[PDB]
Amino acid sequence: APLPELLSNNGKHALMVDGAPYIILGSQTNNSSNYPDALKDVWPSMEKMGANTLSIPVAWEQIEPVEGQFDFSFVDVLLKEARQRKVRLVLLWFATWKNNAPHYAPAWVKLDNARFPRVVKEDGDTLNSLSPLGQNTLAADKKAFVELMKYLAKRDKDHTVIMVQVQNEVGTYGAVRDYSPMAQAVFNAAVPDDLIQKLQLKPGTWSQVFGRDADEFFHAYQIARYCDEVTVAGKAIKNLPMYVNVALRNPFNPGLPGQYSSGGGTDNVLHIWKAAAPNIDLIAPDIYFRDYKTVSKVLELYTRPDNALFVAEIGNDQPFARYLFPTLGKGGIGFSPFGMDDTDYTNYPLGAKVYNDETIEQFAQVYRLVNPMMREWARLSYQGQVWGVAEPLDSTTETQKIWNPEEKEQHKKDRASALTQQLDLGLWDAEVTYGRPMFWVTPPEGNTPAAGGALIAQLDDNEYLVTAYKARVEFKPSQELAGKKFMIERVEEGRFEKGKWVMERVWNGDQTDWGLNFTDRPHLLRVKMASYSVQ
């Protein structure tokens, strides 16, 4: 069985699993489900969701509760139960940092500050965040991580585990960096040549080179070097893909480092992280912004020639489900809503106020569009041209409903324009619209709540794979046609069996007169367009 691998070529990416591109249609447990007794409350949600991959913590405190005394009993049960359900796993190594803090480090780590030191603020107070310059802390984390990877090397030959997250939301809240004597000695000293070279900057100390950014860039660099060393040590045992997940700063209006988690892979320090940690496969955003513009900005910033897009976490409230479409449209390798278990917890206001079957169903509905073509989509995303869009107005607020005669008419025109998206597919364009009948051309009014989206993959110059949700998709020529006319040549609904297209029916007549109209039900279409002479 070939190792999973992240491939990067011509600014595109694939997560290879069993020798072909793979899409993580993911779900992540709540933070306290990493025990055998809790798995009963995880699997039903995962089945209801139709997820193909489970993200779940493996805690340093549980594998090494007494120094040198390893316990992999949780990993044994998890591997067995995952294999029984024919799903894959992403293990989340909760160790030196989990949300900036050492709460998941063993008692013998997190209660020994002298051996395993904390960030010291400028004012001399201590924060509950382990310093990335703690050399004992790095050696201990690395040692335990190596034992976890040795367990997988010996006990996971078919790679049930496809990827490992190293730490969880690293950084520091309440200070920009470590100002300890140990840290100041490194801050005051030369910026390492390797960083100075990769960023093409003039040599000097951190303050000289980075000015107003020296504190933040220094924390980012030391944490990236720490995480890179743990990653290299684990890969030397078994070379799985490994990644870090970011406690995002607001990309538009971030405020100050330490209000957000300073030193994590935030948008302003991706250049430091990529320079400092070449062994970490990707930097994954954890998305809890609900509003379309900010989520779209995060997807743009984290999709780079040097960075595969993996939405390692997203809120589990209804508005987040539609972001699967732009994630995959950007060539994303996966998408993993957070808190998908029945362990009596909700992270509202980040996620759903209520966790029930309806919560899960909002993600199940969009996964049902991708599951039937997962391997074909993954190959097209890597090897070719894909597109994906989500409904670009958020649900109307109570404010807007009350606080909104000729204006009503104007407001409806502005919303209809905003709810109309253009995609350039080469010789053909698609126009995607949201919240309108399946017949005639009444302008779009949006879904209540906002929920729609569309996926398109190019099969050939004039042929597209299309699936969409609570939306209309219409094709037109991309360029003026010089006397020719155009039509849909053929729309087929079907599926892939053993990688071969099987037609179920032809969409025609009402079904293609008014664009291609999708509801909540899955339909996978092959759309062939034609220009023709009327000479």
Residues lying near Na ion in the complex (CB under 5 A) are found at 13, 331, 381-382, 424, 478
Residue 304, strand partner residues:
307
The rounded distance, in Å, linking the Cα atoms of 381 and 358 is 30
Q: Is residue 347 within the footprint of ligand N0N (CB under 6 A)?
A: yes
Q: Is residue 288 within the footprint of ligand N0N (CB under 6 A)?
A: yes
Choose which of 29, 31, 167, 266 interacts with ligand N0N (CB under 6 A): 31
* CA distance to 157, 314, 374, per residue, from 161 (Å): 10, 21, 18
CB 469 to ligand N0N: min, Å: 24
Size of site (CB under 6 A) for ligand N0N: 13
| Residue among 361, 357, 349, 321 at smallest CA distance from 337 | 321
* CA distance to 57, 78, 164, per residue, from 70 (Å): 16, 16, 19
Which of the ranges 221-229, 281-289, 322-330, 490-498 carries the binding residues for ligand N0N, by CB under 6 A?
281-289
CB 534 to ligand N0N: min, Å: 54
* Binding residues among 166-185 for ligand N0N as defined by CB under 6 A: 168-169
Which of the ranges 126-134, 282-290, 329-337, 414-422 carries the binding residues for ligand N0N, by CB under 6 A?
282-290
Encoded tokens for 470: 């609570």
Nearer Cβ to Na ion, position 235 or 526? 526
Q: Helix crossing, 181-188 with 214-235: angle to 10°?
A: 100
CB 331 to Na ion: min, Å: 3
Choose which of 141, 215, 228, 313 interacts with ligand N0N (CB under 6 A): 313
CB 351 to ligand N0N: min, Å: 7
In this structure, what DSSP letter does residue 535 have? -
381 binds, among ligand N0N, Na ion, none (CB under 5 to 8 A by kind): Na ion
Nearer Cβ to ligand N0N, position 4 or 337? 337
DSSP 312-376: EEE--SGGGGGGHHHHHHTT-SEEEEB--S-SS---TTSS-SS-SHHHHHHHHHHHHHHGGGHHH
CB 99 to ligand N0N: min, Å: 5
The rounded distance, in Å, linking the Cα atoms of 381 and 21 is 9
CB 97 to ligand N0N: min, Å: 10
Q: What angle do CA 478, 481, 482 make, to 5 degrees?
A: 150
- Amino acid making up residue 112: D
Choose which of 23, 247, 393, 432 interacts with ligand N0N (CB under 6 A): 247
Choose which of 338, 355, 363, 387 interacts with ligand N0N (CB under 6 A): 338
Choose which of 156, 228, 286, 342 interacts with ligand N0N (CB under 6 A): 286
Whether residue 319 is preceded by a cis peptide bond, meaning omega within 30 degrees of 0, is: no
Q: Is residue 284 within the footprint of ligand N0N (CB under 6 A)?
A: no
Which of the ranges 47-55, 102-110, 153-161, 285-293 carries the binding residues for ligand N0N, by CB under 6 A?
285-293
424 binds, among ligand N0N, Na ion, none (CB under 5 to 8 A by kind): Na ion
CB 309 to ligand N0N: min, Å: 17
447 binds, among ligand N0N, Na ion, none (CB under 5 to 8 A by kind): none
Q: Is residue 380 within the footprint of ligand N0N (CB under 6 A)?
A: no
> CB count, 10 Å around CB of 293?
11
351 phi, psi to nearest 5 deg: -105, -160
* Binding residues among 389-408 for ligand N0N as defined by CB under 6 A: none
Nearer Cβ to ligand N0N, position 347 or 420? 347
478 binds, among ligand N0N, Na ion, none (CB under 5 to 8 A by kind): Na ion
Choose which of 34, 99, 327, 421 interacts with ligand N0N (CB under 6 A): 99
Residue 282 CB partners (closer than 8 Å, separation 6+): 6, 13, 241, 243, 307, 308, 309, 310, 333
13: left (phi over 0), alpha (psi -120 to 50) or beta: beta
Nearer Cβ to ligand N0N, position 59 or 416? 59
| Residue among 471, 521, 515 at smallest CA distance from 491 | 515
Residue 111-150 contact track with ligand N0N, rule CB under 6 A, x = bound: ----------------------------------------
289 binds, among ligand N0N, Na ion, none (CB under 5 to 8 A by kind): ligand N0N
Strand (E) or helix (H) holding 73: helix 73-84
DSSP 124-144: S-EEEEE-TT-HHHHHHHHHH
The rounded distance, in Å, linking the Cα atoms of 507 and 493 is 7
Nearer Cβ to Na ion, position 34 or 381? 381
The rounded distance, in Å, linking the Cα atoms of 202 and 191 is 10
Q: Is residue 262 within the footprint of ligand N0N (CB under 6 A)?
A: no
Question: What three-state secondary structure class fits 501?
Answer: strand
- Amino acid making up residue 470: K
Residue 515-534 contact track with ligand N0N, rule CB under 6 A, x = bound: --------------------
Q: Is residue 350 within the footprint of ligand N0N (CB under 6 A)?
A: yes
Q: Is residue 346 within the footprint of ligand N0N (CB under 6 A)?
A: no
Nearer Cβ to ligand N0N, position 134 or 351? 351
524 phi, psi to nearest 5 deg: -105, 120
CB 201 to ligand N0N: min, Å: 31
Residue 319 CB partners (closer than 8 Å, separation 6+): 290, 394, 395, 449, 450
The footprint of ligand N0N (CB under 6 A) covers: 31, 99, 168-169, 245, 247, 286, 288-289, 313, 338, 347, 350
